Each structure stands twice: as C-alpha cells, then as structure tokens.
Amino acid sequence: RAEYVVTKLDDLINWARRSSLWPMTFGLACCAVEMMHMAAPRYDMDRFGVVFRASPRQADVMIVAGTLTNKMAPALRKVYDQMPEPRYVVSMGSCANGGGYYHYSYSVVRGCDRIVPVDIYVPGCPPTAEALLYGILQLQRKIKREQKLKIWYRR
Amino acid sequence: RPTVRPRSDVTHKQLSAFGEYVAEILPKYVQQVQVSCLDELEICIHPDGVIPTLTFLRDHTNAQFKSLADLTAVDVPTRQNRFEIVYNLLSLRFNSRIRVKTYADELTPIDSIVSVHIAANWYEREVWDMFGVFFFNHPDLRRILTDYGFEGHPFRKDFPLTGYVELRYDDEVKRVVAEPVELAQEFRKFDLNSPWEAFPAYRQPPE
Amino acid sequence: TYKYVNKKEQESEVDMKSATDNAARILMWTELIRGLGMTLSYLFREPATINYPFEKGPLSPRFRGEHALRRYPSGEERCIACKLCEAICPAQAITIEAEPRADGSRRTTRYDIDMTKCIYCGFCQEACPVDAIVEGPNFEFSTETHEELLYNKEKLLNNGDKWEAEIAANIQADYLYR
Amino acid sequence: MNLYTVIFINILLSLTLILVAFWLPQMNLYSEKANPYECGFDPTSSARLPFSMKFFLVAITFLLFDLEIALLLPLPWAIQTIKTSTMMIMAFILVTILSLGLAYEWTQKGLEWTE
Amino acid sequence: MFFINILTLLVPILIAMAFLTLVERKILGYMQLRKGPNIVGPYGILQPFADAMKLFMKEPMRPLTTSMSLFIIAPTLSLTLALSLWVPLPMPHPLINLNLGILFILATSSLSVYSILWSGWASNSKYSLFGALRAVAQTISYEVTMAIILLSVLLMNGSYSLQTLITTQEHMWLLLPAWPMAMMWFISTLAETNRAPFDLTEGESELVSGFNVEYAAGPFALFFMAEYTNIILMNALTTIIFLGPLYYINLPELYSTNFMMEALLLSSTFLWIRASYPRFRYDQLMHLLWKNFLPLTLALCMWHISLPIFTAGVPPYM
Amino acid sequence: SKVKQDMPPPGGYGPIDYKRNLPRRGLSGYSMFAVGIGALIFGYW
C-alpha cells in the first residue's frame, strides 16, 4: 500500500522537524526575558532539542516575544522572510498577540499576525517559561499533525 | 500622625534663600522663582536666557549643578506659548536638585544646551520628536523615537492616542504598508471626574 | 561609606619568590586551570532541570492564570454587572454589556475579556466586590488562532465551572491576606 | 592509486550530500527571502567596497616568515649530515636572524594594527 | 577490500562526529547545571540524526547577491578536506601510508582555511566578509606557530612520518620531553579548529554567524560536519604526536583502545575549554601568538636543534 | 486569635556570608618550575 508507506515517511519527516526545532536568537522585551528563562537550566529547551541560532538562515521558528513597534515591523517582516521554507511563528505574550497594554498606541502593531502568519499564540504578560515551553510542545504536536506527503500523494 | 509626611522647613528655607540668590544674580532672565511644599525649587526664565542660566548653574562655585538629570516638555495647549520646557538639574557637590522652566510655541525655537550638557543632545532630539519644538545649533537634530516616515508630534495634546496611520503586511505589494487607522474596539474614554472639588487650597477665583 | 574595588594599598615590592609565583601564574595558566576545575565541579553536580510535562514548576495560591467567572454554592452567578472591573482594567480588555434578567436580577449579557489585550494584572479580581471574576491557575491554554483568545461570557463561565475545585481552594488559602 | 581513489570518494561523498540537500526539499524562492541579511534591514553598501584591513604589515611579515619556515623544514634530513657543526651553526644563524627580524619589527611597532 | 577499508574509516568517523555534537551538548549542559538532550533518543542518542534530517530537508535558499560557484564549492571542499585529513592517521597502521604525513596535514588544513574564506567572500554579505577577514588573521598567526612547533617536535622525531612517531613513543611519551610544545600545540589546534576561546570566525556575539550567516540548511550542515570532524582530528593528531599510546607488535587493539581513550579525553577537553572561557578579540589572538608563542617557540626550536647534537641522540632516518 | 504575621525568629536569622571568598590554593612557583624542569631533563635523557 502506497498510503501506508507515504504516511510513515511523512511521520518520519514530521518527527525530524519536531525533534530539531531551532528558534532564532530574536526577542524584543520582557517576554524575551521569560524566553531566556525558558532557556535557563530549569525548563531546558536544549534538553527538548530546542536551541537558538542567531542567523535567520539557520532558524526554524520565530518566537515573537515582545511589543512589535511600527518602526520594528519592517525588520521583523524582513527577518521572517529571510528564513528558509519550513518556518513557524510562535507569538508570545499579549503584545505580540494583540498589542496588549499598548493596543491603542500610535506606534504599536496590534498583534504580530498583522505582519507575519502566526502558528501558535501563547497568552500571558509575561507568559511563564513553563507556558512558553507548553506553546513550544504544542507547536511540535501541530507539526506532528502535518501530512505533506499524503496531501501530495492524493494531489 | 503616621499617615502624613514630615515637612523639612529647614530645606524649604534653604531652597528659598538660594532662589533669592539666583533671582538677584540673573534679573535679566528670571521671571519667577517658587519653592513647592515638596521642597523643590523651580526657576521660570525667559527663553533668551537658557544658555546663560544653564551655564551659571553648570559652573558657578556656589551652584555646581554639573549633572543634567532630565530635559522634558509639557504641552499645555491653553496658554499662548503651549510648550513648557523643563530642565531638572542635579548638584552632587551640594546634594541638591533644581528645576528650570522656559516656554515655547510651535514657531519659536529655543537655543540648545548641548554646549553645556551633552545629554541635552538626545534629550532635545526627544523633545523635538515628541513636541515639535525646534532647537537652535543642535548637532544632527532629527527624530529619535518615532518611525522613520512618521508625521506629526505624538506627545502633543491634540494628537490622537492611536495615531492616524497603522501598519500591516500587504501581500500584493509584498510590503509593510501604512493605512488610515481603523480600530475594531474604539478605546472608550471614561469621564472619571467627580463634580465635587477635592482641594479647596487650589480653588481658582471665578471668571 | 564606600570601598574600592580595584585600588591597591601600597605595593608588595619586588621579590624573587613573588616574581617566580607571578611567572608561574602566567606560564602555567593557573587561573585558567582554576576555571576548568570550577566548571568540572559543576559537571559533577546534579542538574536543576525538571522533567517538564510530568514535573511542573512550583507555584503559589496567588498566581494569576486564566480568567474565570465564579458562582455561588447555589449555582447562581456571582457577577452583578457592576462594571468596575472593566473600569479598573488598565488595558480596557473587558466589555460588560448588561440588562435585567427574566427574574429581574442584575446580570450580564455580554462579558468579554480579550486575553490578547489583557496584561494579567489581577486588578479585576482584586476590584470585584463579590469575587466573581478570578484569575485561576491555568496557564497552559495556548491556542493556534487569535480568535480563541477572545473570550466571551460562555467561555469564562465554562472556565469557572472547570476550575472551581482549584480556584475555591486557592481563595480559601489566600483570602485572609487580601 | 589508492590515495587518489580515497580523495575521489570523499569528493563524490560531499557532492552527493550537497546534491541531496539541493534536490530533496521543497523550494519557494522570492526576492525578500534571497535578499542579503544585514540584521533585518536593507544594506547601505554593496558589501564589495574596500575593507581596509589593519594588519597588512603583519600579513607581509607572515609571507616572509612562511618562507623562513620553508627554509627551516628540511632540518630532519639535515641533522643526518656527516659534518653537523656547520649544520648546527647554520641553523642557529637562521633562527637567530629570524628572531632578530621579529624583534626589530616588534620594536618598530610593526605588529601593532595601525588604524 | 580497499573500498571496505575506506568505508570502515569514513562511516565510523561520521558517526563519531555526530555523537561528538551530542556529547558537546550534554557536557555543556551538565557544566551549565542542566541536562543535554534526553528526549529524542533513549538518552538523546537520536538527537544528531534528527538534526541532520531536519537540516537536509530544509531548503538551501540560494541568495541573490551571491557568487554561486564558490558558494556551492566551499562547503563540499571543507568536508572533503576534513575526510582527506582523516586519511593518513595510523591507528597504528594508516589507511594510506605517507612519508610526508605531517606536511600533508598542514597543506590540507590550509586548504580548509581557503574553503572558509571562499564561503565568506562568496556569500556577499558584510558579516560574511567580517568572518572571512577574521579567518585570514587567525590562520596567519596559528600557521606560523604550528609550523615551528611541528618542526621542533619532528626534529626530536626522525622523518616526517607517523609510524616513526609510534616507534619514537614506544617507550615514553613526547609530552615529557616537550611539554611546552604540547601546550602551544594544543592552543594552536584550538586556533586551527576555530574553537573557543578564539573561534572568531563563527562568532555568535561579535557577528551574527560569521561566514555561515547566509548559509541555510544543507551546506551549513556540511560546514558543521567539517568543523567537528576537524575537532576530532586535531585531538587525534595531538594524542598521536604527544600522548603516545602503547604499541605492541602482536596485537594493535590495545593501541587502538588507548588512542580512542586519549582522543576522547582531548575532545572532552575542547568542550571543557568552550564551557570555561570567554572569547578573545581577534587582534588579541594575533598579539598573543606573535608576542608570546612565536618567540618562545623560536627559542625552543633552536633548543631542539641543539639537543640531539650535544646529547648525540640524533634519531635514525628510518 | 492573636495577630499572626510573617516575622523573623525572635533571636533573628543567622549569619549570612557576603564577602568575596576565594580558596587561595595551588603549588608555589618554584615547585612547578622544578617539576617542569625535571620532566624536561628526564624526557631528554
């Protein structure tokens, strides 16, 4: 059966992409402070296989952690575009989710989903490092659910 | 009284004496000298005397205020000169703080004090960016906090809280584009003013 | 008072033994070997990492998590449509449209809390006079869309019914401080 | 022939790896993706302008010292000589004049990265 | 049978460097009061395979402002030079026995530097240019120091071969006769491998990624494989040259085991150094080498010229 | 019901070290240079 072989191959590639998630060394604010608290020895993302890389060319997921300013937004869009193709976005905190405390500001993009397509929204101000790790594992499950080879085979 | 602060009339008297001292040293520029009940000395001067007043306070022997703490502006859009430019100065030698006030309008610039304090460079850039108060003889006076193509000075009272434009990614032009602002929520202003006065000490005389 | 961090008091002169000690420090890399020993000791220590989804991090009964609307033990909703939680909400994240109910009680028809706008400050739960709105301990409620974080009254009442076994215990452990 | 085969096998392995890397995944190429990086902003220059390195004298000295290395390298066969006294004297003189050149450059601040 | 020998040299080296990545992550974690990966494998042993599959299933993302020929040539060049450098090592019998083995090692290392330079210049970006220039400075300093060190040590040895190094260290190590040369050679191997303290070519803090800042997945994995293979190789060369394993003609398995143990110890020493120390400035690395190691190694080269003459301990030609 | 509050113990808390504490160890310079020279001479012989 070609369906079974294609499903198992797709599960293999999803396992690889979810076991090796490389976020970018990119944060903006207090939410990025909690992001490096998720990098801290307690909730070891490197134990989870999640390790920061500075360049967007070696990154897999942008963790938008902070307030996306109007002046910042072209930089964030350029940095996201410069990623290679299997790229994900985890919005983190109320600022990146929907503006948060600075929703009615003249200089704040009301949510980073106006700029980049967001895969996972993590609520909080700040969300705890445990909550960000929860969002990371939820992203891992989300890309475990993907069926690219099966959609291609039935295409 | 365990819920009320102490007063320190001694430092109130000291600041009053120093206010007399500065006001008689510089009568050409000083328009008002006041000391608050919080023991803070404010000297309100003419805009032409910003450089001599700040130089005197930077290096006078009895008034060494060599550190500039703050430089800000307050938009009061009911007076003729709608911007009050405020300098908060620190004296490490005498362990004191002074406040110097001047005024401006949208078309009356003030001489920059970068030649006196170097922090005034970025502080006056911020004042120009947020209030539109131009500064004479400022090296590279430009915006510091707004977006690059931003129009208007947002800390003014007549500028809206949400601004006039907002940014979004457009896939047709593949850019981050600016649109007129359209809120899905419309920030609700609250009239949180009691119709009964709270402080009879500040009751203004009737018109 | 004050102290110096890099100033030295007088000098230790020049001596053959002290010169030999400094020469051995430079040539034999003694402080580098000392740093190696320090991180070796850290290698042989026990790591502080917890197994995350099975061992959760410690918390407190004061913890601000996911919002919830509570009920009386009779089952009646505690909220009385008084709107002062949205008056004190520093992010304007609450919308409390209300009308008299069929039995004439003062209740809400729309109670929306924008979790993407909320700053999770607990001002609503400390302002509420009937302990209706609370911030319970749920923090693992991340969603895959922006819309799922725009809560309404049904969602908040469902959270209150879900977490009441924990929220009531936390309020019992906490209410004497507040 | 053996070393040639191993060299060609390693080259073919690297080529096979990069061919797999280029023909395996899915491509989605557009302009903003393939623009140069420059930390999230458009580059001001073209990254081909003159760079003006600061250790040029050290680089030329490295050329001269590399050729002094080439002179010094036949010593393991030189110590097998039948004379060994002129060999020892010549090696001493060579190392001494190399060290004298290094000392003179150090004194004249040649290896100090003039800005 | 020779192709089978090539496979039994190449495949274990690649698995060894992948698990070197695993060992590096775990050792750095346990020195950082955390763990390493322990979820992907039973004890994290599948983590390098997951990383490799993810990197080879991401797109390579050829850029616009980029000399494509050099951009493609450089990582393949780096990997093939790492394996070619692995070729002539004896454990205790090399795959390819070379008379001028050390000279071959030096030439291949310099060509690997050229791979880094061509990648940095081809990826037409400012951070890549910065990384390439830092690589130029670094290789200037360590090249002159390494050449002098190897000259003096192999003057204590006989020819430029490595089985001769085994027979020289049959009775005693070379660490005890020349330990300052061993210290300077260890520092020079760090500089050659571009490892901490003075990495400075993939400087994550001064630059973004150095010469890999435009390399997306694929050829970036090739560069990483070449770097870590070079790490294991420089440690292996250090233990062959200086910490001579026990050699017996009847059985070579204890030689291979001793070589394995000492190479593992020196690789863990590299990870230890990375955990311990901060980064140099790349002018400070040049100043450090050219002002401390180069005069001392010139003097010690002169001392090792004089030593077999006045002790009559000139090594044999063969 | 007496007033119960978060308070220190009646004798106060114990001493807390806060000054810099470095072990101050290692061999002397003469010993290290002597063992290095001895290793050199033994290896040369």
Ligand SMILES: COC1=C(OC)C(=O)C(C/C=C(\C)CC/C=C(\C)CC/C=C(\C)CC/C=C(/C)CC/C=C(/C)CC/C=C(\C)CC/C=C(\C)CC/C=C(\C)CC/C=C(/C)CCC=C(C)C)=C(C)C1=O
């Ligand atoms: C107050 O102000 C502020 C700041 O200022 C202080 C900020 O900073 C700031 C920004 C804040 C942030 C961005 C927070 C981010 C967090 C941090 C900066 C701190 C976290 C720590 C670090 C970044 C340092 C990490 C340190 C480490 C030691 C971790 C190790 C990391 C590494 C990259 C090295 C190890 C390597 C890897 C992880 C990958 C290795 C694996 C591979 C490449 C695999 C390759 C292998 C192969 C290809 C093998 C294939 C071959 C085979 C034969 C295999 C066979 C396969 C088969 C399938 C059979 C903000 C916003 C801010 O407000």
Ligand SMILES: CCCCCCCCCCCCCCCCCC(=O)OC[C@H](COP(=O)([O-])OCC[N+](C)(C)C)OC(=O)CCCCCCCCCCCCCCCCC
């Ligand atoms: C391979 C075998 C193992 C090797 C050692 C591996 C484990 C130890 C690793 C330690 C950490 C290394 C990480 C990188 C460190 C980089 C910094 C560094 O090392 O800088 C070099 C430092 C530099 O120190 P520095 O830079 O601080 O010096 C100050 C100099 N100025 C002021 C000009 C800047 O030390 C050296 O250069 C010393 C090199 C070794 C010297 C050895 C001398 C031996 C004795 C000779 C004979 C003495 C007797 C004389 C004759 C008597 C006759 C009777």
Ligand SMILES: CCCCCCCCCCCCCCCCCC(=O)OC[C@H](COP(=O)(O)OCCN)OC(=O)CCCCCCCCCCCCCCCCC
């Ligand atoms: C991506 C492109 C990469 C291009 C660059 C490739 C670099 C390869 C690795 C680095 C090589 C550096 C130079 C090494 C030269 C050989 C060293 C040596 O000593 O060779 C001599 C040796 C036999 O000499 P000896 O040890 O004295 O033995 C006599 C008794 N036993 O052995 C011999 O006599 C064998 C002579 C041949 C050995 C080298 C074979 C190279 C083959 C060509 C490779 C490149 C081809 C072009 C590109 C292909 C497409 C990409």
Ligand code: SF4
């Ligand atoms: S959501 Fe809160 S914690 Fe996060 S960046 Fe905004 S203000 Fe900071």
Ligand code: SF4
């Ligand atoms: S926690 Fe604070 S920001 Fe959130 S709904 Fe309550 S009052 Fe508003």
Ligand code: SF4
């Ligand atoms: S939740 Fe509480 S504070 Fe808010 S409207 Fe209801 S009763 Fe009032």
